[PDB]
Design an enzyme around this catalytic site. Sequence first.
Site, PDB file in Angstrom:
ATOM      1  N   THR A 150      48.774  79.263  83.200  1.00 23.42           N
ATOM      2  CA  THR A 150      49.135  80.141  84.536  1.00 23.42           C
ATOM      3  C   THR A 150      48.071  80.603  84.937  1.00 23.42           C
ATOM      4  OG1 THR A 150      51.642  80.311  84.017  1.00 23.42           O
ATOM      5  CG2 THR A 150      50.751  81.778  85.227  1.00 23.42           C
TER       6      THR A 150
ATOM      7  N   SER B 177      50.933  75.077  78.713  1.00 27.41           N
ATOM      8  CA  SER B 177      50.841  75.052  77.262  1.00 27.41           C
ATOM      9  C   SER B 177      52.086  74.639  76.474  1.00 27.41           C
ATOM     10  CB  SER B 177      49.961  76.305  76.656  1.00 27.41           C
ATOM     11  OG  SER B 177      51.051  77.251  76.354  1.00 27.41           O
ATOM     12  N   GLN B 178      53.221  74.880  77.119  1.00 30.81           N
ATOM     13  CA  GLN B 178      54.310  74.538  76.592  1.00 30.81           C
ATOM     14  C   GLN B 178      54.358  72.937  76.263  1.00 30.81           C
ATOM     15  OE1 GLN B 178      53.959  75.292  79.742  1.00 30.81           O
ATOM     16  NE2 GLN B 178      55.711  74.906  81.165  1.00 30.81           N
TER      17      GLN B 178
ATOM     18  N   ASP C  50      51.865  80.336  76.433  1.00 28.28           N
ATOM     19  CA  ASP C  50      53.324  80.095  75.479  1.00 28.28           C
ATOM     20  C   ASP C  50      52.934  79.653  74.224  1.00 28.28           C
ATOM     21  OD1 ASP C  50      54.513  80.392  77.949  1.00 28.28           O
ATOM     22  OD2 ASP C  50      54.966  78.416  78.284  1.00 28.28           O
TER      23      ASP C  50
HETATM   24  N1  LIG Z   1      51.563  82.248  81.528  1.00 30.15           N
HETATM   25  C1  LIG Z   1      51.504  81.289  80.923  1.00 30.15           C
HETATM   26  O1  LIG Z   1      50.603  80.638  80.824  1.00 30.15           O
HETATM   27  C2  LIG Z   1      52.807  80.482  80.884  1.00 30.15           C
HETATM   28  C3  LIG Z   1      52.669  78.612  80.855  1.00 30.15           C
HETATM   29  N2  LIG Z   1      53.959  78.215  80.717  1.00 30.15           N
HETATM   30  C4  LIG Z   1      51.616  78.269  80.065  1.00 30.15           C
HETATM   31  O2  LIG Z   1      51.677  78.652  78.721  1.00 30.15           O
HETATM   32  O3  LIG Z   1      50.888  77.261  80.263  1.00 30.15           O
END
Ligand SMILES: NC(=O)C[C@H](N)C(=O)O
EC number: 3.5.1.1
Lengths: 334, 328, 332, 328
Positions: B14, B60-61, B92
Amino acid sequence: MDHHHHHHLPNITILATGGTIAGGGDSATKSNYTVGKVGVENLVNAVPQLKDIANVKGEQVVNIGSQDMNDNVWLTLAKKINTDCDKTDGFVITHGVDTMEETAYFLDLTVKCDKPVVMVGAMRPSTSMSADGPFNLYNAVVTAADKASANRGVLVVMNDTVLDGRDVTTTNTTDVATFKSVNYGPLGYIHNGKIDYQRTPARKHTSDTPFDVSKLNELPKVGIVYNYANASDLPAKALVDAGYDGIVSAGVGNGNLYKSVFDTLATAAKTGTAVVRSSRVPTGATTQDAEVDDAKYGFVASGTLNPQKARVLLQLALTQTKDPQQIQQIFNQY
Amino acid sequence: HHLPNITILATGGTIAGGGDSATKSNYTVGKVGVENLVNAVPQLKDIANVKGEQVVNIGSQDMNDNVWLTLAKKINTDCDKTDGFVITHGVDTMEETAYFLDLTVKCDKPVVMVGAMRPSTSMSADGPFNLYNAVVTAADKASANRGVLVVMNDTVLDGRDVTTTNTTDVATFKSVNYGPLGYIHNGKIDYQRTPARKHTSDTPFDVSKLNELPKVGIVYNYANASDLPAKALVDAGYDGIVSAGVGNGNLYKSVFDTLATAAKTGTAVVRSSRVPTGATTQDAEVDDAKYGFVASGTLNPQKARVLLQLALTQTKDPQQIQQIFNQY
Amino acid sequence: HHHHHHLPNITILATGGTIAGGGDSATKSNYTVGKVGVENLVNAVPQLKDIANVKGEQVVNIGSQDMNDNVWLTLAKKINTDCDKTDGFVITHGVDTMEETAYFLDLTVKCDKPVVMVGAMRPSTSMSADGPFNLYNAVVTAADKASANRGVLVVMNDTVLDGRDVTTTNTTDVATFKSVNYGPLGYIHNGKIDYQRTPARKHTSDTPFDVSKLNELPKVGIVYNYANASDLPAKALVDAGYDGIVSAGVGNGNLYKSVFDTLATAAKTGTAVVRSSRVPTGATTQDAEVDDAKYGFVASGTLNPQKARVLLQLALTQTKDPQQIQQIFNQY
Amino acid sequence: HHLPNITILATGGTIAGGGDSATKSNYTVGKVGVENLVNAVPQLKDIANVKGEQVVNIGSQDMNDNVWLTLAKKINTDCDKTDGFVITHGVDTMEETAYFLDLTVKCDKPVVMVGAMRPSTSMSADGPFNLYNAVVTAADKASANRGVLVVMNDTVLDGRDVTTTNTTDVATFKSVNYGPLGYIHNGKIDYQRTPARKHTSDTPFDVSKLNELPKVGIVYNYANASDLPAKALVDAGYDGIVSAGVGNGNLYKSVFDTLATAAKTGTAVVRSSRVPTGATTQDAEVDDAKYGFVASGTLNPQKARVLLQLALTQTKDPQQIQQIFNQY
Ligand SMILES: NC(=O)C[C@H](N)C(=O)O
Ligand SMILES: NC(=O)C[C@H](N)C(=O)O
Ligand SMILES: NC(=O)C[C@H](N)C(=O)O
Ligand SMILES: NC(=O)C[C@H](N)C(=O)O
Ligand SMILES: [Mg+2]
């Protein structure tokens, strides 16, 4: 005509299920112990001051570690409480800490009795130096006997704190202070046998839910899968292949799913499996309107319900409905 | 010429994301390139000569073993060419990657991970100052020899203990068992702690010639838990299984039965906990020696997976794996 | 249209003893006495609440080696006054003179409801302390309707003993209390009593002894007999104008000649003289070696010296005639 | 085969008593001489050459120090002229004479005391067979070196522990703390015990030149006990006082106060018990060393008197008296 009155102590029923509160080991000092081996009579007799606050009656329901809690025991407890409501002034349930936060929520949704139901456990076995069980049991009885405790839902009392069954969770593997309501806080604190309640749960509970388990002999099958880097889709696929009615995902961050896992759950939802996104993250809501288009896939967001609590609500939701939109409304109201 | 040389390795998240507007909580991840991230914080020029490279650009998920191997090999190869590294990543799974690098990086120059809870486009976006402070941290010679670090919300956190504690709070990252290493104020750090567990150049884990990692899955415990997830991993011949246990690492009876069988049949089994703080200990309710199980200590399930994968590059022997879990 | 469970109301009158004592460790043998209050003894046995509705009152808090006539009078008056206000009584007491208090109350209590005495050889703080279960069994006994009309009782070591025949037989054994001539009335197992005996001697409401208005009791002392016994103790009681003297005789109540001489004189001057025996069992009989009628002496029967003192004091509230005192000793 | 020479020293007692009826209880002591007693048991000729001497002829309720001295001196003087002694004696104070002799006799040959609960004229009189069994015991070489003995109701009892337990029963004599030494059947003894406390030639008590013993009196404790008995013995200048205490040697407050003052003046004070079995111990509720008191152990008040009088021939120091009470 009477010429004076006397104080009457409330009748409190203890429903014993096991736990470390009823655990024992062979040394006061060593950590090793076996759970659920001490009967309810023994627990009561270890708190001789209970007679000052209530007329206590003990019943042994089961004697297990809460790591082996299951749907059968939950149904037994709810039905017993609802049947026996008129026979007592309040209930205390002695229970293991490991899944206390699940049972408490189940009971918070399915009990219809409007008298207090208080759950209690211990982090140290009954045989240990400075064992926490006795005073926890005392304070649990204090809470169940307090007229102010009614109409607050099912409660957990540990470490001098009254916690609501929906938000409460165990936060530490060993600490006597482990139980906390990590999103919205406790209801009240206990000092010198008196409670100052400053909060009550706003989500609907007990007699304000539609969940009626009085005739049920089983619950819908709901499994939980974990997310992490390079997560295998094999756990999810196994639950789908077995015809599970629901699956809860312990997502990363705000309920996100590893792609393989996502793909299996999307597919499953399309065939009618109910899929709830929760989070492995210990606080905060899994929200709608973040990276997952729940509407499009037929998924439900769990809000502040952690995966194991989300499982509890989803099994109950599934007794009423299979429609994702109606299940989302349930997760928004209970 | 008077400033340190810092390399940014970008992986997405993000921090590199984007919303349709400043208020909208809906957003795409890993879409901005490293050059645009650097250029958006011109004050970086006050503190370092910053060079950026794009490794991948993902949420990162969807982080995986292939990215981990890439990152460790790149840091190890390029160590001598720079003074410090900053890795932009999603929140994540940051706690997993940080720990993997903490164990496999052999460079003792600072390696600092950073992310953001909000995209650049959102009101009060956290990523710019986070990036600034991460570069401050990577440029500080006091940051050396402390293992791989995460810098978020003005705090420096070791990669073993750090974890995300809240699904949306900018202050989510906390070292929940042992605390942070230092706080950042006015571009300076007062370090008061360092991790005692062996890290980086003090571990035996050498990933330089590995193209894949041992297969390790995680199963969850809860009331009435199905044994089917665990059986699916056993049936696929997984090298290891981490249990996210209830309380102090305990197992639902059906899951215990399957894992007890797996530990005698060629699967390493680690007991961890779904509980967010505290060790999964020996000498409680489970006789680990009898079953051939390893207790995870303070490692949560996802971090126990990291360490089990790497242990399984060295050994399959449960006693030896337990000793690894006691040292790293 | 509805029934309600009820438990007997039992009043605990505390007087002290090692049952209410303390020591500095679980193993050492040096005990304090009469230190803990009744509320604390009761609270320590939560199981009492399941067999009785217990209320406690502290009368005194002494070692029974210091028991006296004033405490006896208090106890009898309290029990007689409060008989209609409870279903039964337990009295916590020291072991040393339990057998005396029990017999005094056996003769002066007019309540037919159970009155049960209890003590302990160890304080609560000692390893394997006997007082908690002793208390429990005393309350079981006082709550059992079958315990009524049997006189004052002593309950120790799972046994129900009558207050006339009970005595302490050993200086330290938890099993010390025995009814050494006629046996126990019943044994206690699993909170139930199988009574097989009751005392035939008249007790409680069948005696004429009424202490309700008395502030003091007649003065009665005890003299010991042995080889070469000095008559000085007997002379000192005579010189003080004692109302009675009990002889702790040798064998079947016999007296050393110089003690005999002093007491024979005293008896003709109107001192009451009872022959008892230092020997721990059996009766001091008539028709052996001493012509009691010639000397004006009374034979104690199975009453040991300290029990014989109790009855003689009470007899002396009624009469000073030796023939009449002998008839009392034949009936109570 | 040669029969032992046994001497019978007669002192009176019911064994020598008579009444007008075989079936009424009334009797007088000393109606018969030693010759008469011996000749009533012609069976003694089967087992010994018996010689009788009448020393006194009294009821043992009138036993006194002068008779004790006469007895010990006679036994010690005549030891070489005979093979063993039987002393016929009253029951009432037998246990006192037996212990006095147990401490002052220096002859190692058997000394056996015997009496009867029924006079010689009674139906089923116990004295004939008692006398027979006492001569059996005195004639048995195994009886030597066991101290002074009491033989009643087919039982051989040591002089230290033996006491009369019942006012009328023929089976009255028992060793209530440590048990009998042996039982007699068909004229034969199976000894299985011997006293460990020092006796006879192993004591320092030598009464050969004494014509009086130290004055020692006994006071009883009970509820509301008068201090007047104790004060009278103090005012007479008694050398020692024994307390027949309640329970484990306890004293009524006013008696305690008299004896505490007396002990500081130099009177020896021994705490015994009216309770028929068990030791009056140290380290219970009385601080003996503080008060200058001695604890009697298993010695009852009348036996404690015996040992106290003898101790006072050696010493009046309470620590030394206590050591005596621990050894004899
Ligand atoms: N705030 C974030 O970075 C969440 C995002 N889903 C990630 O982990 O890539
Ligand atoms: N503290 C506890 O109760 C842990 C135990 N395993 C249980 O949950 O039953
Ligand atoms: N065990 C006891 O109670 C002995 C104590 N001296 C008493 O009689 O008070
Ligand atoms: N049975 C007896 O010997 C009693 C007698 N008064 C005595 O001791 O001399
Ligand atoms: Mg009332």
